[PDB]
Design an enzyme around this catalytic site. Structure first.
Site, PDB file in Angstrom:
ATOM      1  N   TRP A   1       6.238  36.778 -38.930  1.00 58.93           N
ATOM      2  CA  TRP A   1       5.473  35.533 -38.928  1.00 58.93           C
ATOM      3  C   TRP A   1       5.157  35.043 -37.528  1.00 58.93           C
ATOM      4  CZ3 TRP A   1       3.641  35.256 -43.483  1.00 58.93           C
ATOM      5  CH2 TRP A   1       4.411  35.700 -44.573  1.00 58.93           C
TER       6      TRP A   1
ATOM      7  N   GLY B   1       2.383  27.381 -41.678  1.00 56.51           N
ATOM      8  CA  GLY B   1       3.265  27.379 -40.536  1.00 56.51           C
ATOM      9  C   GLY B   1       3.651  25.947 -40.219  1.00 56.51           C
ATOM     10  N   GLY B   2       3.654  25.086 -41.232  1.00 56.75           N
ATOM     11  CA  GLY B   2       4.052  23.705 -41.031  1.00 56.75           C
ATOM     12  C   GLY B   2       3.227  22.941 -40.017  1.00 56.75           C
TER      13      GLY B   2
ATOM     14  N   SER C   1       1.075  27.238 -47.945  1.00 55.32           N
ATOM     15  CA  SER C   1       1.917  26.213 -47.330  1.00 55.32           C
ATOM     16  C   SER C   1       1.086  25.166 -46.581  1.00 55.32           C
ATOM     17  CB  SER C   1       2.925  26.869 -46.387  1.00 55.32           C
ATOM     18  OG  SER C   1       4.065  26.043 -46.250  1.00 55.32           O
TER      19      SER C   1
ATOM     20  N   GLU D   1      10.892  29.113 -53.767  1.00 55.72           N
ATOM     21  CA  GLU D   1      10.288  28.496 -52.584  1.00 55.72           C
ATOM     22  C   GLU D   1      11.280  28.005 -51.525  1.00 55.72           C
ATOM     23  OE1 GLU D   1       7.280  28.390 -51.738  1.00 55.72           O
ATOM     24  OE2 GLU D   1       6.042  28.651 -53.528  1.00 55.72           O
TER      25      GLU D   1
ATOM     26  N   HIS E   1       9.435  32.070 -50.336  1.00 44.30           N
ATOM     27  CA  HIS E   1       8.273  31.321 -49.891  1.00 44.30           C
ATOM     28  C   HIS E   1       7.460  32.219 -48.957  1.00 44.30           C
ATOM     29  CE1 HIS E   1       5.891  28.031 -48.280  1.00 44.30           C
ATOM     30  NE2 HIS E   1       6.406  28.169 -47.071  1.00 44.30           N
TER      31      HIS E   1
HETATM   32  C1  LIG Z   1      11.203  28.463 -41.441  1.00 42.05           C
HETATM   33  C2  LIG Z   1      11.570  28.846 -42.882  1.00 42.05           C
HETATM   34  C3  LIG Z   1      11.047  30.244 -43.258  1.00 42.05           C
HETATM   35  C4  LIG Z   1       9.507  30.350 -43.216  1.00 42.05           C
HETATM   36  O1  LIG Z   1       8.806  29.883 -44.127  1.00 42.05           O
HETATM   37  S1  LIG Z   1       8.756  31.239 -41.784  1.00 42.05           S
HETATM   38  C5  LIG Z   1       6.902  31.108 -41.990  1.00 42.05           C
HETATM   39  C6  LIG Z   1       6.217  31.290 -43.414  1.00 42.05           C
HETATM   40  N1  LIG Z   1       4.718  31.079 -43.483  1.00 42.05           N
HETATM   41  C7  LIG Z   1       4.019  31.196 -42.143  1.00 42.05           C
HETATM   42  C8  LIG Z   1       4.191  32.101 -44.365  1.00 42.05           C
HETATM   43  C9  LIG Z   1       4.426  29.743 -44.040  1.00 42.05           C
END
Ligand SMILES: CCCC(=O)SCC[N+](C)(C)C
Ligand SMILES: *[C@@H]1O[C@H](CO[C@@H]2O[C@@H](C)[C@@H](O)[C@@H](O)[C@@H]2O)[C@@H](O[C@@H]2O[C@H](CO)[C@@H](O)[C@H](O)[C@H]2NC(C)=O)[C@H](O)[C@H]1NC(C)=O
Ligand SMILES: *[C@@H]1O[C@H](CO[C@@H]2O[C@@H](C)[C@@H](O)[C@@H](O)[C@@H]2O)[C@@H](O[C@@H]2O[C@H](CO)[C@@H](O)[C@H](O)[C@H]2NC(C)=O)[C@H](O)[C@H]1NC(C)=O
Ligand SMILES: *[C@@H]1O[C@H](CO)[C@@H](O)[C@H](O)[C@H]1NC(C)=O
Ligand SMILES: *[C@@H]1O[C@H](CO)[C@@H](O)[C@H](O)[C@H]1NC(C)=O
Ligand SMILES: *[C@@H]1O[C@H](CO)[C@@H](O)[C@H](O)[C@H]1NC(C)=O
Ligand SMILES: [Cl-]
Ligand SMILES: [Cl-]
Length: 522
Positions: A79, A113-114, A195, A321, A432
């Site tokens: 990621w 990625g939040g 996400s 999730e 997730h």
């Molecule tokens: C930080 C907790 C684990 C994750 O979700 S890492 C990134 C996942 N993604 C970029 C697909 C949302």
């Protein structure tokens, strides 16, 4: 091959895929680099060029902190950005079928990625398989993340907030004005993301300025009503200031920005992590905010009162999730053991995931999730479900329910297949973000997955494509289960797995009643 766009010519590259060929244009600029005085400001229109722009490699990824909790581990490193980080990162990619299509449907990906990390050059977001197998055009773009993309100072053009969302919007506009040249159909554009990407998609359904930039929407494990999706005006303020103090920029709010614009990207990235006194593993320090420009009112209000683009949506979540976030803060957890935790550890876990919540608020969670049906993994599984239900599943179901109440067809899926190649331990289950590879069709490549997974991916790719092209996620040729529309009353959804696909109803009925009705009060 050379294509002529409104801002200039661009050259792509030919790719061999499944005995066929796809044409890729990696790294096309879509906005003036947000550098210098432009840092923190909305993306400016790009300056037209002369000569041919070589779009033969992924461009820079936007500045962002990287995950370092597991050096050398593919589970987490897959990621991390696989391209040089830089403030000069407003580029997009295009995958078109070959021979060139005449009026193909367009799929625009928005990575998650939040809102703090992510990039479109990741291996799992390669659009060449979809361009090949479904003859659709795939577009993806990089948008500013973290403080550089969401620093909020409402009403102030120097740092208005939602800059990253505006980057995405400017990219969607680019497709409107240029995709016809690549043989695409600007009237048939489907947005999809996972996400934070999904939450982004849902926000475009709410933003008037984006209404005419797309046709349909696909939201995988995310929606704006998720508790981590929208930063409150109070939080934004306390964070913008905390970042100021941390970089010795405390001041005239405009001078604060001028000061921050002299700071080095790293100084800013380094301090983003401490703006929040006690943050959760989701760590959305700087995200979307009600800015009065992109978002004109609290999203919950707009959703509730039917103020959004009326169209079909495809929404869904994965079975486990929450598990993934447990190893990023939850005591007693580890990707290297079965993580059998105790009641006491579970309670400390809640402290981590629900920082500012009252003692009674956390007890209600415990009460609701601990009525055991003894088993050593009870608490481990309960905490995972707590995190997953609260942060993703329930918000997704609630969004779907409310959205469909205004007449639009909606389809909901429950992804329950664990990749045979998953690097994480078995107790994390169907994690997730791991349905993404199926959507992009990586399993279609035999050089890698079981036969069952190849078939599953093929079905999903077809359903996603049919939804994009016709607004109906059916697989009409191989005697497949019909995907029923999701309605507030019956609430039917489709399960996706290798065994057998089923039509079920009222996913997590008891758990969501808790998160959606009770908890919001405490
Ligand atoms: C930080 C907790 C684990 C994750 O979700 S890492 C990134 C996942 N993604 C970029 C697909 C949302
Ligand atoms: C709003 O921010 C204040 C100040 O945060 C502090 O300064 C920042 C630059 C950063 O370094 C933070 O880690 C600091 O905490 C928060 O108040 C602080 O709360 C913590 C709680 O552990 C406490 O230790 C500090 O003494 C407090 N500092 C001050 C000056 O009050 C406050 O909690 C934030 N508001 C909310 C709603 O969380
Ligand atoms: C699973 O591991 C955790 C984490 O421990 C670390 O990782 C292990 C794989 C091993 O390398 C340890 O040496 C590492 O410390 C264990 O949790 C720890 O438990 C101890 C004692 O109970 C406690 O003092 C630590 O604070 C815990 N660390 C944290 C914060 O998780 C856990 O006990 C292991 N699960 C099992 C198999 O029991
Ligand atoms: C683009 O690639 C072609 C490949 O032959 C090369 O001739 C050209 O110089 C490149 N453009 C630039 C600006 O480097
Ligand atoms: C693409 O399809 C749209 C309708 O969906 C139509 O209006 C448009 O003319 C088509 N573009 C072409 C093939 O020129
Ligand atoms: C339909 O079935 C055929 C053969 O049984 C298979 O090869 C193909 O991948 C399936 N098509 C879809 C869209 O799933
Ligand atoms: Cl109590
Ligand atoms: Cl089936």
């Amino acid at each position: 091959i050379i294509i002529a766009t409104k801002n200039g010519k661009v050259r792509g590259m030919q790719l061999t895929v499944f005995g066929g060929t796809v044409t890729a244009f990696l790294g096309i600029p879509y906005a003036q680099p947000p550098l210098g005085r432009l840092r923190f400001k909305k993306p400016q229109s790009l300056t037209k060029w002369s000569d041919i722009w070589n779009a033969t490699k992924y461009a820079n990824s936007c500045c962002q902190n990287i995950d370092q909790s597991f050096p050398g581990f593919h589970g987490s490193e897959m990621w991390n950005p696989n391209t040089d980080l830089s403030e000069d990162c407003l580029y997009l990619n295009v995958w078109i079928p070959a021979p060139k299509p005449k009026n193909a449907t367009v799929l625009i990906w928005i990575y998650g990625g939040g809102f703090q990390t992510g990039t479109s050059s990741l291996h799992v977001y390669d659009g060449k398989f979809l361009a090949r197998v479904e003859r659709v055009i795939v577009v993806s773009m990089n948008y500013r993340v973290g403080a550089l993309g969401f620093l909020a100072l409402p009403g102030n053009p120097e740092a208005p907030g939602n800059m990253g969302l505006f980057d995405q919007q400017l990219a969607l506009q680019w497709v409107q004005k240029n995709i016809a040249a690549f043989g695409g159909n600007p009237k048939s554009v489907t947005l999809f993301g996972e996400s934070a990407g999904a939450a982004s998609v849902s926000l475009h359904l709410l933003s008037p300025g984006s209404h005419s930039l797309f046709t349909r929407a696909i939201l995988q494990s995310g929606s704006f009503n998720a508790p981590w999706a929208v930063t409150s005006l109070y939080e934004a303020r306390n964070r913008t200031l905390n970042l100021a103090k941390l970089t010795g920029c405390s001041r005239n709010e405009t001078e604060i920005i001028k000061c921050l614009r002299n700071k080095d990207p790293q100084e800013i990235l380094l301090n983003e992590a401490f703006v929040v006194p006690y943050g959760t593993p989701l760590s959305v320090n700087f995200g979307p905010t009600v800015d009065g420009d992109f978002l004109t009112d609290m999203p919950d209000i707009l959703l509730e009162l039917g103020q959004f683009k009326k169209t079909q949506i495809l929404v869904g979540v994965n079975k486990d999730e929450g598990t993934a976030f447990l190893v990023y803060g939850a005591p007693g957890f580890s990707k290297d053991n079965n993580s059998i935790i105790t009641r006491k550890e579970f309670q400390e876990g809640l402290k981590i995931f629900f920082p500012g919540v009252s003692e009674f608020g956390k007890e209600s969670i415990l009460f609701h999730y601990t009525d055991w049906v003894q088993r050593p993994e009870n608490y481990r599984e309960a905490l995972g479900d707590v995190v997953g239900d609260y942060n993703f599943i329930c918000p997704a179901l609630e969004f779907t329910k409310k959205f469909s109440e205004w007449g639009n067809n909606a389809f909901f899926y429950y992804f329950e297949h664990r990749s045979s190649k998953l690097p994480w331990p078995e107790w994390m289950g169907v994690m997730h973000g791991y349905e993404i590879e199926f959507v992009f069709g990586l399993p279609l490549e035999r050089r890698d997955y079981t036969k069952a997974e190849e078939i599953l991916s093929r079905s999903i790719v077809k359903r996603w494509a049919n939804f994009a092209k016709y607004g109906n996620p059916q697989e009409t040729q191989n005697q497949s289960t019909s995907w029923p529309v999701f309605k507030s009353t019956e609430q039917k959804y489709l399960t996706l797995n290798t065994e057998s696909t089923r039509i079920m109803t009222k996913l997590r009925a008891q758990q969501c009643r808790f998160w959606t009705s009770f908890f919001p009060k405490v």
